């Protein structure tokens, strides 16, 4: 077993991964053996070879800035500037769901490390009055739409829920889901699968040991999505369920319209093989990727790749030229997703960033470098746009659809902001449905008072502000106001 | 003299302000008598009459949402959508400055109560590397323009600084300015004056006693600006200084472009007598009043007065219909302002608002009520757009021009970290746009968009991002980074 690993490491020029073999406890060494026997060394060498020949190849080419073109008018639909077309699209979305032809695919992360937390993000509770986690909010949205679809089409239906997770976080996410009785969905319609990993490598392409017996690993990027789908036969599953369309999104957006039937409807009606939802970027320095065309191909340019000039460029109308802010919310046809998984994905190389990788040295001290000593390779989910034959963009309102949980409260994209955004939305819903909020003396608060008016509507009651006139129309409320399966509460 | 008041308060139905007289230390009597003798009763009832013949009157009228139309495109200028125009407006601005035809008019408030401090906002150190106060940052923008305007027209020139402040904060602000030798400016060119004040009223227009010997007093709002100018002849002082244009602005915005020549230039070119700078409101629930017309009359509708429906209305272009977010930044002709002060402001009545006024009960006790018991009367700066013969509106970018200091440093917007970041980010950009570059510990350059990259440039060096090429073009820096009268420094 070990002289077959040896042979393979040698073939790959990675002999040094057993540097410390003769210093390990039998248990430590058949813990490291496991890790290595899993990896494919021939392939990783290829990945590295091809990826370096770009981080030093297109590195003698034009800065992306000059190759960049804005989204064409002809391609984008707008939640705002396309009125009561929304209706037609909503209906098309619910018809699709109704016929069991839609599924959601969730990029759950791994651990809430940036968050300061050991549990995966989305078991995070941002301190909503209901204190539901992101998982639960999202489950309830799936479930709400299976109710609203049955209401408008009379047929009982399901959105199967594919959830991708890091290998650390699987059994826990499963246990969390099992403990909560899948929040009312059926175990059968929740499918957990695991992201792959890539090792950190030296500039010279030597795989790096984090410890005498751990190789320095990290996820392969959001774009590891596709390789993971193949590995776990996720597509065969979707086909045998008879699924046509996948909504793809990330766990961290608390406002996320899971399986948004407007988006799905849009994309279905326009026969798109691929759509990306976006919010309008209005501040040049906003840390957000822009959807755009590079050398004529659709993709996202990350926010840390653009010149301040590019960012500050303004179209005729006063807006930013590159204003299609990417929120990691996508539509895929199954057929197009299947060709990306079985054909177009391998047809890619990895993105390469220089990283300061901590490693164990010859003498066994854990060093922490102060210049970068190696690279991480990542694939991005939005890299496949280039293969869409008919790609669309759908512009939504930030405050209705996007407020991500990225940081701890130590200034933006944190629990306070996420929470404030969901409560402001739901506040507005009540006003939009005829409701009013009222202070202790019972005189009514203005719609824009100024702490923040606390409001929370279970998704089971309203997916996106519908279904509330019965609860709130011409009634006044003292916040905190909650609306759930047992009605309103003050 | 003490008997006059009895009759004076009798002849206004305010006799109850001596309610506790017989109980007071006669030191407490001097105190109250002093407070009371200097007031114009009759005027205060008259205000309360004319201000209540309207908080009742509009009562039985259409809501403000049905009488609101946007600013017409013909009136609106824009830093984004209008280009070589900007260099043109700029140089007109400078020339006006350079012929000494320009003053500024600062609304400092009173104490930074909302901010959790006993001093006015002008003195707030948002915690920049230079630890400069707002007052300083502003003063030094007045100096820089003087220098810039002179390099561009020959003549040396001044931009007088009329500072309005609360009666409390006056002598603290003079002490502060003196402590700092007027930040570089001459003391002859800083002219301070005091905001007046109004007492709280019961719903019956009876003046309210906060304690046995204290009338419950408040500021008369920004709009007292006008009355405040008349009292201390501030108009004549400008007329005889030979000033034509006034840039009027409030103190709490760290990015404010004091006497901005672009905005002045626009207003002069368009021949406006009145101008409001504004920034694009894009989020319906942003608490920022909007400039617009109500019954075809120009004014500001405050964010607290509109329905959500109005806030969420949208023009064909996908933008908010009412997107002219008002940043308390205006341009006045003196003639106009002269007329506003002497003639038009007295024509107005006061805005009325129920409040919970701490008052003293006849059973001695000092009560802070839970229900609102009386009213504040106020006036606003923007109440007088309607009298302008030519109103104009100038849109600018938020990130360059507007970041206000409103709340104490929570984990919350519009506060010290916010303000601090906005100025840093702005200057960080100023550097990149002048060919500068930024560098980690190891020396590889870091992206235009990455704590935040700390960068502070003295108004002395650069007002709005000009003159940096001298210091930063094709050059690579390591932050924190200060550029300063005495060179660049990597701190
Ligand atoms: Cl192998
Ligand atoms: Cl839990
Ligand atoms: Cl809160
Ligand atoms: Cl009610
Ligand atoms: Cl009198």
Q: What is the CATH number of domain B1-435?
A: 3.90.550.10
- CATH T-level assignment (fold) for domain A1-434: Spore Coat Polysaccharide Biosynthesis Protein SpsA; Chain A (3.90.550)
What is the Cα–Cα distance from A317 to A314, expressed in whole angstroms?
A: 8
CA count, 13 A, side-chain hemisphere, B330: 26
From the list A419, A437, A418, A417, the residue with the least C-alpha distance to A427 is A437
Cα Rg for chain A, rounded, in angstroms? 24
Contact by Cβ (8 Å): B263, B329: yes
Q: How many residues are given for chain A?
A: 490
For residue A475, say if its preceding peptide bond is cis, omega within 30 degrees of 0: no
DSSP per-residue letters across A25-60: -HHHHHHHHHHHHHS-HHHHHHHHHHHHHHHTTGGG
Residue A409: CB atoms within 10 Å: 11
Q: Is A440 in the B-facing interface, judged by CB distances under 8 Å? A: yes
First to last CA, chain B: 65
Which pairing describes strands A487-489 and A481-484: parallel, antiparallel, or unpaired?
antiparallel
Per the rule left: phi > 0, alpha: psi between -120 and 50, beta: everything else, A285 is alpha
Tokens of B241: 């200084």
Resolution in A: 2.5
Alpha-carbon distance of B344 to B294, in angstroms, equals 18
Give the span between the Cα atoms of B13 and B215, in whole angstroms: 15
CA B219/CA B222 separation, integer angstroms: 8
CA distance B95 to B92: 5
Query: Which residues make beta-bridge pairs with B246?
Result: B103, B332
Long-range contacts of residues B342-347, Cβ cutoff 8 Å, at least 24 apart: B342/B230, B342/B235, B344/B384, B344/B387, B345/B223, B345/B226, B345/B227, B345/B230, B345/B379, B345/B383, B345/B384
Is A303 assigned a ligand-binding role in the annotation? yes
Architecture of domain A435-490: Ribbon (2.10)
Break sites following residues in chain B (C–N > 2.5 A): 411, 450
Number of DSSP helices (H) and strands (E) in chain A, helices first? 14, 25
The neighbour count for residue A23, using CB atoms within 10 Å, is: 11
Sequence-distant (≥ 6) Cβ neighbours of residue B422 within 8 angstroms? B254, B255, B399, B403
Spatial separation of the C-alpha atoms in residues A305 and B448, rounded to whole Å: 8
Contact (CB, 8 A) for B402 and B253? yes
| Residues A223 and A381 sit within 8 Å (Cβ to Cβ) | yes
Of B81, B318, B433, the CB nearest to A81: B318
Provide the 8-state DSSP code for A344.
Answer: I
Q: Please, which residues have CB within 8 angstroms of residue B364's CB and are 6 or more apart in sequence? A: B212
Overall size of chain B counted in residues = 491
Give the Cα separation of B205 and B43 in Å (integer).
12
For residues B319 and A61, give the distance between their C-alpha atoms in angstroms, rounded to a whole number: 39
- Give Cβ neighbours of residue B44 (< 8 Å, ≥ 6 apart): B12, B198, B199, B207
CB A259 within 8 A of CB A97: yes
Same fold, A1-434 and A435-490: no
Residues of chain B with C-beta less than 8 angstroms from the C-beta of A311: 448-449
Flag if A314 and B283 touch (Cβ within 8 Å).
Answer: no
Buried/exposed B57-68: b ≥16 CB within 10 Å, e otherwise: eeeeeeebbeeb
Q: Which ligand minimizes its atom distance to the CA of A132?
A: 2
Residues of A in contact with B306 (CB under 8 A): 446-448
Per DSSP, A24 falls in state S
Q: What is the 3-state secondary structure (H, E, C) of chain B?
A: CHHHHHHHHHCCCCHHHHCCHHHCCHHHHHHHHHHHHCCCCCHHHHHHHHHHHHHCCCCCCCCHHHCEECCCHHHEEECCCCCCHHHHHHHHHHHHHHCCCEEEEEECCCECCCCCCCCEHHHCECCCCCCCEHHHHHHHHHHHHHHHHHHHHCCCCCCCEEEEECCCCHHHHHHHHHHCHHHHCCHHHEEEEECCEEECEECCCCECEEECCEECEEECCCCHHHHHHHHCCHHHHHHHHCCCEEEEEECCECCCCCCCHHHHHHHHHCCCCEEEEEEECCCCCCCCCEEEEECCEEEEECCCCCCHHHHHCECCCCCECCCEEEEEEEEEEHHHHHHHHHHHHHHCCCEEEEECCCEECCCCCEECCCCCCEEEEECCHHHHHHHCCCEEEEEECHHHHCCECCCCCCCCCCCHHHHHHHHHHHHHHHHHHCCEEEECCCCCECCCCCCCCCEEECCCCCCCCCCCHHHHCCEEECCCEEEECCEEEEC
* Alpha-helical segments (H) within A318-468: 334-339, 398-401, 415-432
Tell me if A441 and B287 make a contact (CB, 8 A cut-off): no
How many other C-beta atoms lie within 10 A of the C-beta of residue A226?
24
E-only strand ranges, A372-454: 374-378, 391-396, 436-437
For A202, the enclosing helix (H) or strand (E) is strand A201-202
Other CB atoms within 10 Å distance of the CB of residue A339: 15
Q: Quote the tokens at residue A200.
A: 């950190």
Q: Does A446 touch chain B (CB under 8 A)?
A: yes
DSSP state of A343: I
Cβ-contact A161, A183 below 8 angstroms:
no
Among candidates A371, A399, A440 on the partner chain, residue whose Cβ is nearest the Cβ of B283 = A399
Minimum CA–CA partner of A303 in chain B: B449
CB contact under 8 A, B81 and A432: no
CB contact under 8 A, A441 and B282: no
Instruction: Give which of B131, B380, B159, B165 is closest to B252, Cα–Cα.
Output: B165
The separation between CA A416 and the C-alpha centre of its own chain, rounded to angstroms, equals 20
CB contact under 8 A, B372 and A450: no
Are B485 and B140 spatial neighbours (Cβ–Cβ below 8 Å)? no
Residue with structure tokens 């103190």? B251
* Cα–chain center distance at A425: 21
Tell me whether B73 touches chain A (CB under 8 Å). no
The last residues before gaps in chain A (C-N over 2.5 Å) are 410, 450
Distance CA B100, CA B156 (A): 9
Instruction: Nearest chain B residue to A308 by CA: give it.
Output: B448
Residue B264 near residue B102 (C-beta atoms within 8 A): yes
H or E element, residue A7: helix A2-11
Sign of CA dihedral B362, B366, B370, B374: positive
Q: What is the SS3 assignment for A364? A: coil
| Residues with Cβ within 8 Å of residue B3, at least 6 apart in sequence | none
Ligand 1 centroid – CA A207 distance (Å):
13
- Residue ranges covered by each domain of chain A: 1-434, 435-490
Q: Do the Cβ atoms of B251 and B107 come closer than 8 Å?
A: yes
Helices A2-11 & A26-38, crossing angle to 10 degrees? 50
Helix (H) or strand (E) segment spanning residue A76: strand A76-78
| CB neighbours of residue A355 within 10 Å | 16
Exp. method: X-ray
Q: Token digits for A219?
A: 């996820």
Distance CA B399, CA B401 (A): 6
- Determine whether B207 is exposed, middle or buried from the number of CB atoms within 10 Å of its CB (0-12, 13-18, 19+): buried
> What gap in Å lies between CA A154 and CA B416, rounded to an integer?
56
Angle of CA points B84, B89, B95, to nearest 5°: 135
- Nearest alpha carbon to residue A260 among A274, A249, A252, A244: A249
Query: What CA–CA distance (Å, rounded) separates B197 from B185?
Result: 30
Residue recorded with tokens 């909560």: A180
Helix (H, G, I), strand (E, B) or coil at A210: strand
C-alpha triplet B282, B288, B291: angle, nearest 5°: 90
List, in order, residues 6 or more apart from B230 with CB less than 8 Å away.
B341, B342, B345
Among A266, A218, A259, CA closest to A106: A259
Q: Which residues of B touch A428 (CB under 8 A)?
A: 284-285, 308, 312
Answer CATH for B436-491 from 2.10.10.100, 3.30.70.1450, 3.40.30.10, 3.60.15.10: 2.10.10.100
When CB atoms are compared, the residue of A311, A424, A428 closest to B448 is: A311
The reply to whether residue B399 touches residue A432, judged by beta carbons under 8 angstroms, is: no
Q: Measured between beta carbons, which residues in chain B are less than 8 angstroms from residue A448?
A: 285-287, 303-304, 306, 308, 311
């Amino acid at each position: 077993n070990v002289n077959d690993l040896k042979q393979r490491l040698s073939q790959a020029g990675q002999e040094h991964l057993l540097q410390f073999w003769n210093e390990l406890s039998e248990a430590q060494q058949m813990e490291l053996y496991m890790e290595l026997q899993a990896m494919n060394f021939e392939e990783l060498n290829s990945f590295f070879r091809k990826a370096i020949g770009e981080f030093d190849r297109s590195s003698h080419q034009e800065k992306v800035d000059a190759r960049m073109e804005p989204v064409p008018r002809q391609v984008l639909g707008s939640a705002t500037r396309d009125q009561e077309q929304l209706q037609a699209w909503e209906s098309e979305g619910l018809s699709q769901i109704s016929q069991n032809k839609v599924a959601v695919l969730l990029l759950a992360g791994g651990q809430g490390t940036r968050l300061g937390v050991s549990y995966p993000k989305g078991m995070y509770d941002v301190g909503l009055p209901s204190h539901k986690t992101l998982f639960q909010i999202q489950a309830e949205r799936i479930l709400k739409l299976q109710q609203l679809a049955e209401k408008h089409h009379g047929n009982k239906c399901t959105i199967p829920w594919y959830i991708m997770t890091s290998g650390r976080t699987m059994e826990s996410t499963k246990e969390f889901f099992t403990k909560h009785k899948f929040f009312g969905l059926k175990k059968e319609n929740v499918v957990f699968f695991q992201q792959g990993m890539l090792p950190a490598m030296s500039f010279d392409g030597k795989i790096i040991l984090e410890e005498k017996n751990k190789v320095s690993m990290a996820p392969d990027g959001n774009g590891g999505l596709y390789r993971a789908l193949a590995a776990q036969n996720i597509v065969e599953d979707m086909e045998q369920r008879g699924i046509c369309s996948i909504h793809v999104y990330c766990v961290d957006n608390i406002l996320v319209k899971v399986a948004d039937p407007r988006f799905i409807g849009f994309c279905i009606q326009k026969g798109a093989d691929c759509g990306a939802k976006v919010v309008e970027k209005t501040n040049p320095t906003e840390p957000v990727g822009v959807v755009c065309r590079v050398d004529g191909v659709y993709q996202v340019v990350e926010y840390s790749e653009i010149s301040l000039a590019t960012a500050q460029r303004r179209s005729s109308d006063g807006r930013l030229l590159f204003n299609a802010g990417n929120i990691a919310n996508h539509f895929f046809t199954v057929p197009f997703l299947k060709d990306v998984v079985n054909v177009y994905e391998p047809q890619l190389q990895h993105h390469v960033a220089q990283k300061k990788i901590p490693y164990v040295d010859s003498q066994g001290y854990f060093i922490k470098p102060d210049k970068p000593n190696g690279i991480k390779m990542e694939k991005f989910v939005f890299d496949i746009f280039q293969f869409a034959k008919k790609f669309v963009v759908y512009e939504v309102l930030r405050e209705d659809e996007f407020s991500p949980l990225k940081n701890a409260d130590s200034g933006k994209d944190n629990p306070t902001t996420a929470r404030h955004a969901l409560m402001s939305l739901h506040h507005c819903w009540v006003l939009n449905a005829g409701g009013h909020f009222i202070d202790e003396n019972g005189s009514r608060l203005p719609a824009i008072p100024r702490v923040p008016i606390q409001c929370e509507i279970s998704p089971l009651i309203s997916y996106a502000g519908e279904g509330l006139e019965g609860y709130v129309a011409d009634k006044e409320f003292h916040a905190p106001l909650i609306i759930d399966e047992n009605g309103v509460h003050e």
